[PDB]
């Protein structure tokens, strides 16, 4: 992020549009509240819920919320594994909203 942020700075200093310098990000959406909002807005196409969240109530409602909005959801082991994906230690849930046409 720092190198990309700096590169945008010299681009603006050079007099270039900030939109066209950087491409649209395509990344996993993480964080419990952010993923919950995506499910309620039907923007998440896949939800991965950690099986060992403590307290459990943080994700007990999530399968029902995913089912009502028709979001495909799987319960995956190791919140630690989800953390490694998103560069953190532990992650309660992971949500995939957009992927490239190669991986569609």
């Amino acid at each position: 992020k720092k190198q990309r942020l700096v590169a945008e700075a010299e681009a603006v200093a050079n007099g270039k549009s900030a939109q066209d310098v950087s491409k649209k990000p395509y990344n996993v959406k993480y964080g419990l509240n952010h993923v919950v909002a995506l499910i309620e807005a039907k923007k998440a196409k896949l939800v991965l819920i950690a099986s060992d969240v403590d307290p459990i109530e943080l994700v007990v409602f999530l399968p029902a919320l995913c089912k009502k909005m028709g979001v495909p959801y799987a319960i995956v082991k190791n919140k630690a594994r989800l953390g490694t994906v998103i560069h953190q230690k532990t992650a309660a849930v992971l949500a995939v909203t957009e992927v490239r046409e190669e991986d569609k």
Partner: peptide
């Protein structure tokens, strides 16, 4: 584009 990132690239440029 991100306006907060716009402030941050301006900060880094400064």
């Amino acid at each position: 584009p991100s306006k907060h990132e716009q402030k941050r690239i301006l900060q880094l440029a400064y």
